[PDB]
Specification:
The structure holds three protein chains of three kinds. By secondary structure, chain A is mainly beta. Chain A is built from no helices and 21 strands. In chain A, β5 (48-54) and β6 (59-61) form a beta hairpin. The relative contact order of chain A is 0.17. By secondary structure, chain B is mainly beta. Helices cover 0% and strands 22% of the residues of chain B. Chain B has one strand at residues 3-4. The chains are: A mainly beta, B mainly beta, C mainly beta. Chains in contact: A-B, A-C, B-C. β1 (3-4) of chain B pairs antiparallel with β10 of chain C, so a sheet runs across the interface. Chain B: This is Transmembrane protein gp41. Chain B: It is a single-pass type I membrane protein. Chain B: It is found in: Virion membrane; Host cell membrane; Host endosome membrane.
């Protein structure tokens, strides 16, 4: 059974160098034609191929990133390392490493190349965020069938939790995925829809553990 | 101009 | 540079349907094409390799065909776990291109978004920034367009938006769009408008307010 797992820093600053490690088991990078590649995926976006290295040490890189990438293997440790220099915020994404089969052999003779046409086993992926930002609690603002909510702005890093009426209110609640602002700080909104007749009290409970910032803000019309 | 995969041909 | 285009980019279906997804390449890639299914929060999972070979352990309802520039993936009887995003990948030329993906979601009746607009709070204004937000609530399908207008000037580059995952009971989506201005800029205008275009609206709905107007 083949397994791969990515490791590295979850946070890195612009201009810095990012070093990612893929540790695997179930195969060896000394096995004929086997490969290990790297693929990344920005939040909510498509997959983007980065590089690949084979057991014979042949390597290939994405042409648009080849001046910033280096891929290497440590055969004895069953690891593959990807180094990306001069990172910028657009480099934030989930990074995956994956296995590529080599040709099927019969009595040590290659007989089928069909199996190499795919990346068959993938790692769970490691989330990497690029920001020059320091740990910072959010500022919570009110957003006043009726709709209301809370704007949880300017915090770092993810994540933050938002509940309504201490957990008692769940129906009609929509807590949106945070967006990484150009400032390097996150921002999100949580809203709740209710019957205009209710306007019952409504309080958003915000918690950003990384900064031990807890806030309860009552929102009214 | 496109380079062929390791296993192509 | 090789182009790998998936069609459609999004697709609505129901449990039991048979669906097909296609991937077209700008140049022939012979049979070197793979199909993956990716569920939110997980890595892509291999379904078909080469262009028609069924990966071991993958249910027989998945099938792949084509060669050269046209490939298609078909799921004969859609199961609940198949609502996800699918991707094709080309491994004939370096770099090994991935298609843009096609989101397969739960079909339901068309539903226009209920639109709401929120002016910035006086509390935020004291800090020097103004966030204006627009909410598009419980709509379907997912495709929606929001256009900000300030004193009829079309806004660009100063808004960000995010969308919820399809609701497990509603089968609807909700979207938030935040227009961000400095307090100075905010106080230099009066009409803040959120224009919404959606399939469920016969024509665009605009929600707005007049700053200062008390």
């Amino acid at each position: 059974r083949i397994t791969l797992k990515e490791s590295g820093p979850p946070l890195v600053k612009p201009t810095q160098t990012l070093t990612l490690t893929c540790s695997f088991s179930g195969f060896s990078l000394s096995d004929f034609g086997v490969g290990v590649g790297w693929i990344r995926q920005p939040p909510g976006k498509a997959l983007e191929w980065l590089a690949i290295i084979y057991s014979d040490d042949d390597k290939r890189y994405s042409p648009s990133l080849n001046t910033r990438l280096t891929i290497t293997k440590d055969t004895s440790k069953n690891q593959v390392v990807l180094v990306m220099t001069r990172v910028s915020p657009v480099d934030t994404a989930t990074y995956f490493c994956a296995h590529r089969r080599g040709p099927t052999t019969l009595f040590g003779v290659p007989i089928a190349r069909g199996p190499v046409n795919a990346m068959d086993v993938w790692g769970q992926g490691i989330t990497v965020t690029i920001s020059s930002t320091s740990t910072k609690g959010p500022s919570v603002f009110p957003l006043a069938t009726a709709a209301l909510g809370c704007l949880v702005k300017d915090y770092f890093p993810e994540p933050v939790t938002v509940s309504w009426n201490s957990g008692a209110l769940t129906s009609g609640v929509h807590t949106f995925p945070a967006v990484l602002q150009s400032s390097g700080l996150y921002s999100l909104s949580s809203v709740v829809t209710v019957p205009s007749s209710s306007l019952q009290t409504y309080t958003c409970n915000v918690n950003h553990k990384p900064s031990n910032t807890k806030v309860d803000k009552r929102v009214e019309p | 101009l496109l380079e062929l995969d390791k296993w192509a041909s | 540079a090789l182009q790998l285009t998936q069609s459609p980019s999004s697709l609505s279906a129901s449990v039991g349907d048979r669906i097909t997804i296609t991937c077209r390449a700008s140049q022939g890639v012979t049979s070197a094409l793979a199909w993956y299914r990716q569920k939110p929060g997980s890595p892509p999972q291999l379904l078909i390799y080469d262009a028609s070979s069924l990966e071991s352990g993958v249910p027989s309802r998945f099938s792949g065909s084509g060669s050269g520039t046209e490939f298609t993936l078909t799921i004969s009887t859609l199961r609940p776990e198949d609502f996800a995003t699918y991707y094709c990948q080309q491994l004939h030329f370096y770099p090994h291109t991935f298609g843009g993906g096609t989101r397969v979601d739960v079909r339901r009746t068309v539903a226009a978004p209920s639109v709401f607009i929120f002016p910035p709070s006086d509390e935020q204004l004291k800090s020097g920034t103004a966030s204006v937000v627009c909410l598009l609530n419980n709509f379907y399908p997912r495709e929606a367009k929001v256009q900000w207008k300030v004193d009829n000037a079309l806004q660009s580059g100063n808004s960000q938006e995010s969308v919820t995952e399809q609701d497990s009971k509603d089968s609807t989506y909700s979207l938030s769009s935040t227009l961000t201005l400095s307090k100075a800029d905010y106080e230099k205008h009066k009409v803040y408008e959120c224009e919404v275009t959606h399939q469920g609206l016969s024509s665009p709905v605009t929600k707005s307010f007049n700053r200062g107007e008390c």
